[PDB]
Amino acid sequence: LSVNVNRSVMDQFYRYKMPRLIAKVEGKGNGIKTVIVNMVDVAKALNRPPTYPTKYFGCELGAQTQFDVKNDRYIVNGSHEANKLQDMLDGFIKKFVLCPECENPETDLHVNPKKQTIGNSCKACGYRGMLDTHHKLCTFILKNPPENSDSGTGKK
Numbered sequence: 308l309s310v311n312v313n314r315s316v317m318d319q320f321y322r323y324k325m326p327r328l329i330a331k332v333e334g335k336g337n338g339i340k341t342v343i344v345n346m347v348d349v350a351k352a353l354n355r356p357p358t359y360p361t362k363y364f365g366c367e368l369g370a371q372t373q374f375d376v377k378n379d380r381y382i383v384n385g386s387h388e389a390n391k392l393q394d395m396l397d398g399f400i401k402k403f404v405l406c407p408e409c410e411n412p413e414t415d416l417h418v419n420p421k422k423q424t425i426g427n428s429c430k431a432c433g434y435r436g437m438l439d440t441h442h443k444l445c446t447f448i449l450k451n452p453p454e455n456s457d458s459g460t461g462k463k
Contacts, residue, residue, distance in 0.1 A: 332386035342382040367395050402443040409434045420452040
């Protein structure tokens with residue numbers, strides 16, 4: 308490796324982007340807190356800031372959260388690396404992705420606004436059924452009902 312770090316840049320930047328989660332460790336709070344400077348950028352670029360669900364994640368690291376309004380910077384007690392945040396958040400998705408029939412092949416999930424429920428289909432055995440199992444991340448996502456009708460296939 309005889310070039311620049313390119314840690315903050317490297318993609319060709321032409322049309323496709325990948326908002327990865329970046330975590331930074333600081334020496335403040337009880338002696339070590341995690342500060343996410345990309346949580347608002349990634350959340351704002353795809354939706355709102357997960358300041359509400361920030362408490363659940365803190366419960367896992369034994370730490371809670373911290374918010375700055377005059378600063379717009381939010382920190383979570385405890386120091387963790389970006390790769391670590393994916394492991395815990397990944398366990399949440401594991402609750403439904405690993406279905407008792409398609410816990411391997413990539414499956415899709417379709418939520419119907421008429422029945423107010425999430426469907427789950429796997430392209431490996433036809434599974435295609437319901438997505439929920441129990442009070443799990445399925446409800447958080449179910450809060451975003453899609454939009455469809457009886458005709459007009461095409462618009463995105």
